[PDB]
Amino acid sequence: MRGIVTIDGPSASGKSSVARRVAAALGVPYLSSGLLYRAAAFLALRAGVDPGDEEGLLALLEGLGVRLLAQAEGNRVLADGEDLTSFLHTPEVDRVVSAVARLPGVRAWVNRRLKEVPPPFVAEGRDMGTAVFPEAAHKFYLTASPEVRAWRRARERPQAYEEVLRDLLRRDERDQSAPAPDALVLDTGGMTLDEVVAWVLAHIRR
Ligand SMILES: Nc1ccn([C@@H]2O[C@H](COP(=O)(O)O)[C@@H](O)[C@H]2O)c(=O)n1
């Protein structure tokens, strides 16, 4: 695989772990777009800025040279040389990331970073196959019910399914990229993620 593979889906749909596994199996990097949005949210929080000031947030993001490091075991984000990754998959970031992800300048910043990487790679996100790499040769979209998404997210947070589901449902209401028209759509509530990885790899290697 010498081009680009995109794997998009809603939160906790499995696109991150599937992308990491598919990429490892192909011997190419994977790019987690969400980790960049999480980093922008975490930095805006810690910086004490009003995230509605896009100009100031973008000066902060550009000034700290925030960069995505693709490592086979999992991506890392460094800001002024500091690895922020351990602070990004937390309840506070989950709860505020939507406020910065909707800012056009922040999406442009994330997309610029991603579009810098030389192919091949597997990129995962919400809109990798639609907004960022519409030319990708292999596109996949993973669907998942709110219930299985809340169950998976709860496994990785202090909160339980009951609360996570309420949170995800309110977030869903609050906003969206649909699958790309040429993406293979797979529901991760029917197939196990191990089966999804195998199925995605069989399509890529054909
Ligand atoms: N391509 C992407 C990836 C993530 N996001 C935003 O980043 C937030 C975090 O990403 P994750 O569900 O992939 O970890 C998402 O909830 C969403 O707000 C996005 O808006 N577009």
Author numbering: 1 to 175, 178 to 208
Question: What does the published report state?
Answer:
NMP kinases include adenylate kinase (AMPK), cytidylate kinase (CMPK), guanylate kinase, and thymidylate kinase, which catalyze conversions of respective NMPs to the corresponding nucleoside diphosphates. NMP kinases are bi-substrate enzymes that bind both substrates simultaneously to catalyze phosphoryl transfers. In this research, we determined structures of the ligand-free-, CMP-bound, CDP-bound, and ADP-CDP-bound forms of CMPK from an extremely thermophilic eubacterium, Thermus thermophilus HB8 (ttCMPK). The overall structure of ttCMPK consists of three domains: CORE domain, NMP-binding domain, and LID domain.
In contrast to the CMP "open" complex, this complex showed a closed conformation. We designate this complex as the CMP "closed" complex. The RMSD value between these two structures (196 Cα atoms) was 6.56 Å. It should be mentioned here that crystallization condition for the CMP "closed" complex contained AMP-PCP, an ATP analogue. No electron density of AMP-PCP was found, and no significant movement of the side chains was observed in the ATP-binding site.
